[model samples]
Target: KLNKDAENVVKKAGIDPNSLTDDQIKALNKMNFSKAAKSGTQMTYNDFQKIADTLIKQDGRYTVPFFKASEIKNMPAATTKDAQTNTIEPLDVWDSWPVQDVRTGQVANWNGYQLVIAMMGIPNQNDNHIYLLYNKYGDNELSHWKNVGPIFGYNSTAVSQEWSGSAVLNSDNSIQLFYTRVDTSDNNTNHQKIASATLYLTDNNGNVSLAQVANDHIVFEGDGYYYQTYDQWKATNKGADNIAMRDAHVIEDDNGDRYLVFEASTGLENYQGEDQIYNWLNYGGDDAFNIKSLFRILSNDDIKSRATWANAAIGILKLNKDEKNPKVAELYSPLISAPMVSDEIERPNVVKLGNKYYLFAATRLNWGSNDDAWMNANYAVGDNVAMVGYVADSLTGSYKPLNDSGVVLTASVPANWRTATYSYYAVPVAGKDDQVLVTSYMTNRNGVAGKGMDSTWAPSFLLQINPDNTTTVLAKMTNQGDWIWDDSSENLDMIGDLDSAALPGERDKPVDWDLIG
Candidate 1:
């Protein structure tokens, strides 16, 4: 069943409602792209019809939100909210993930304090320092946060250097912390890999610490077979497409099987692989996509433009069995792919509600096109980043966009489109069924020195999942936030026992605010 507005739009097209196929209905809905997301006027019926004829032919790509903007502009100033003092970290912090157990899907309660790992460092340096932080369970303000210092590699020679990834507290009190490790060869400086470190949760009479139990090891990288890798990334001019294969979020299905879902890209070298063509069918793509449709889709643009604008995906990998150490050996196909739609898919995350798996990711509106938003009046010059999402019945099943088009949340109208908060993560709210809390870090909040946006934790908001699998940003939270310990859960032994706490290895070195760089 289509929404009233969609039904009206369909009716406006003079189509017989009773005869519309599911794919056609989906095509119409997706073709109803948000002009506001692009800071453009609503698409004219003539223009919509023009795009619709070809867009129906290009099925999976339509669902990916393509804004008609180049950069962000004419946006009102966003909320400053709480500045430096109110932040959980002393220095700038961005892109935080909690220590969650895949089994429970809640922030792990380690003898009371809920642990978090955030990218914390100076203004320009984001990848280097990841500090271990703690806040009391259910702390609304996140006011009780205390930094336990840097958790992993800081020096150039260090091994477990991570940029952004998730952590899973396993059943045996061992912490399976997965991260995007940046490695370097003699020539390549940006070899991004998904790696892990095992740490045991130590409980000494309720005074807890996380001690490293195993050396940091590699999980996997994009193999250029199913997902694109550093090889493809290196081949491309880094100006158009950003490197993916980061944000490795480990999710557990109902059957206890684990899958690692991450932000990835279509294989540039062998992008027209069987796996790539097959997953496209899972969306509302052409039935004969493997053969003529794939090439026909490729035929729409020159190979260079297709390579530049057309491939960002949420890649999945099924984990190989080992009770103690789970590893990903099988590179399953992508959850979804957007070709000729977007080149940016960041922070791929999933939350299972009932039988439906909701997929959400952060995407910049600019499609990295040379035509430029200014060159096209239908386009604008400013950024319009959106938190887009899709819903799938099973972990490896067909994915349909939430609300037809996948553009769910963005900066508020007169949307700042540019240097606003980004890297959105959603978690189910305790006691509220089908309700999720969304959090992101404020970028360019306040200009310091030469840096445009001061990166820090931004005020979080709420998203309500309606019965139709659509979602909306309901309200901004009164305070900064993180995932809460499920109130319905049985009280664990650790409550507020942060009197004596320690993390393995050296705490982060203190930097003087006034010291010369």
Candidate 2:
């Protein structure tokens, strides 16, 4: 009876029953026969509309307050505001790269008073440089060429960067910075370089463009970029005999001795197979400018026979040095039991938030491409989007998923952004309320640094995530929005690859930085 009546109703209304939702069809099946008879064919029209409404109605399930990227137009430079200043500013002085404040000792907590940032300056495609800009005006003034010459690593230009001012204060107040550099090998053979610098600065707002202190050692500059380093760094891992170290963190133990904790990945340009990664436990410096080696806390070989899923628990080695490596060496290593969002977790940055430690890292879908933001924006699947989360209790026990379902930030369907993830910095700001802010970028397809302007994948933005996990973009740093959606009145300019044709004699020529010699 129901089928026959449904067919009659479809024929009368000139509508297809297949188009109706399950709820709509159920309501139709339960429709009052007497009422429908009196209402005639007009009742079917109501059913169709109801089904459409069910499918299109905006449900308030994950309804969190969020501002559209287009809302944040422009923000002024060198300005300080406490409380949630809904002000928007464009960081268009340079593109891509990474940004961190220059402070002495310990990480710089955002007090909203003084801040400085370092970004990648792409004068040319072949030239990968770093730029200095102060939070006061957010303008690029002091320019420093981090690497003497660029070779190749993971994301050769500016994969990741960090600033510590622990040394400057003379006590634990020295400044330390680390970043990944690409190593250009024939077939990805050369070891990637992790460039680090220990610095001290009084004036962060100065425009000292005259001279810059270049990097000391070009660590692993050829291939395999050293992605992320933790707040506690060390000089060596895998016991004192294994002194080779770069990407580790150093921390003073309860005994007042310093220790190094870091992870090294195996299988260059490949993922989860014969390629095995190792976790080295090293210690050093009972004092500044002094460091020593410890022991290997964990190894991929030791857990080779374990289940593949054990990797989720065996993945990141989160070591805290006091007596031993793992605070809990029985159930879980002193390691954070979080795997890469996918199979490959490239860059990992762990920070202490309140009582918990939040780990921020990037992932690739199938582990193939360079995970270039631009190429991923235009590529097929899972190139750019990554995730960051917080761990409760300890790194040894089961960690609560910070971004449970998937990554919080991701690729916008047809929007200007290609992909967005783990590149972020958080600081404490003294304002009317307990406010802290995080800033992140979008990797657009254009070669500037991160997301380009207005191209199909150009409309990129720097987002501000409040302490409550709520978000509002401070400004639209790039003029390029999705396709033609760009509003030109924003008064923002994009930094692009140098116009080769405009160069005097050598077009497509490589003028290596003089420091390479």
Candidate 3:
């Protein structure tokens, strides 16, 4: 009897099954179907299957014994009007990054624990402090969490840090944290820089703690090229000055090379047809100030090392249409750009689903306004604010909106709810197929510095992507608490199995904001 399914997997992997000797066939049959997870244990065949499917579908780089579409099931969609029907319960806000309002945070699953690297700060001041929250999946999982204190924060120097950043769990057992550090303390230079910190998880008698590597430093600084008024930016001639870059998201290609993709502005060059790109952008006027492009940085050396990061090549994702700004006359053909329906688009993220690359971004139309009318006219979807997205055949060009309306997840807040909700990040659940988890933060009322506004952590949502490539909410406003607690018992054994050097408690260290030369 032939194992037809296994043979198909071999064929898809580009191997001739018939050419394999009997011993080789036997070896293939005994191969482990398990994948090493960030959580420390091996992911089941079901988990590995989803990753294999994504890689094979997106880039044709993965091979498994066989591909079974039936193995991936559609998660139940939110079916009630109450909205809370999809709510993640235990019915409580678990933890806020800073004591006051929790800004943006990114979640990564590691060894049965969900790790959130979030921003914390004082109102009216720059929010540069970053902390880690660890949730172990078992009894009291929601009630009790390890609130690890500031791993990174502002030194109050010439450059102050703000927002939160993305993290990558490496095969070497180290973690990389990338974030935005701005030159805000100096009134003359108001630009942003991309900074990073490398964490080594240390084990002290069964407890896990984090320490930063010596080279926690800045990777990229602005060159003033993006500014329309080069003189204002102190740019003698137009080239690479006044360009601001921030919001770093690190992803890996099928070939195993590492790349960093983030949002950037105003770096039109002095190349042969640079004027054409500039002329097209003039229509945007000052809107160009808020306009942004997705930039890519490829690095092969130790990203933590200053020498390697400083010399990396930075490439732009050019506009899909020639009419778009940031367009050059005739060079770097086919390096298409991302779209912005509104003037402001930031915090961009890209994920490969099926065979297409989907671009997700947080957008704001008019800056510096509480005018609900302006917001409703330009940025509203029905009565709610949303996370918008588009899809493209390649990582570069010909991108189209995910739907006629690009609103992916919207808040239930009324039109009068003037406080803006910004979508920060989204990720595919490791074991789930066509399921994505989205995160955002919302505050009722408006900003008043020290005078606080009523705020709530807008619950996260789970979305289902259909065969047509359209998406619908499978679950809405679901809390991370519910997701981890529901299956707590089943995963309890896996929770405590940390790396031998890992410790399991919180390290509360105060951030020293005072700048020192």
- Judged by whole-model lDDT over C-alpha atoms, candidate 3 comes out at 0.37
Per-residue alpha-carbon lDDT of candidate 2 for residues 340-379, written as tens digits (9 for 90 to 100): 1112333344444444434443333222111122233324
Q: How do the residues 174-276 of candidate 1 rate in per-residue lDDT, one tens digit apiece?
A: 7777788886553545577887777665655534555555757788888776687787667755454566778888888888888888877767432522233
Off by over 4 Å in 2: 1-124, 137-174, 185-190, 200-215, 218-271, 274-343, 364-384, 394-399, 403-407, 411-422, 425-436, 443-517
So what's the TM-score on candidate 3? 0.53
Error of 2 at 464 (Å): 12
Q: Candidate 2: what lDDT?
A: 0.27
lDDT of each: 0.54, 0.27, 0.37
What TM-score would every model get versus the actual structure?
0.67, 0.42, 0.53
Candidate rank order under TM-score: 1, 3, 2
Off by over 4 Å in 1: 1-90, 153-160, 185-188, 203-208, 235-241, 268-309, 367-382, 413-419, 445-453, 485-517
Q: Is candidate 1 or candidate 2 better by lDDT?
A: 1
lDDT of 3 by residue, 44-73 (tens): 112212222232232211111111111111
Model 1 lDDT, full chain set? 0.54
Best-performing candidate as measured by lDDT: 1
Model 1 is weakest, by summed lDDT over 10 consecutive residues, at 37-46
Candidate 2, backbone clash total: 63
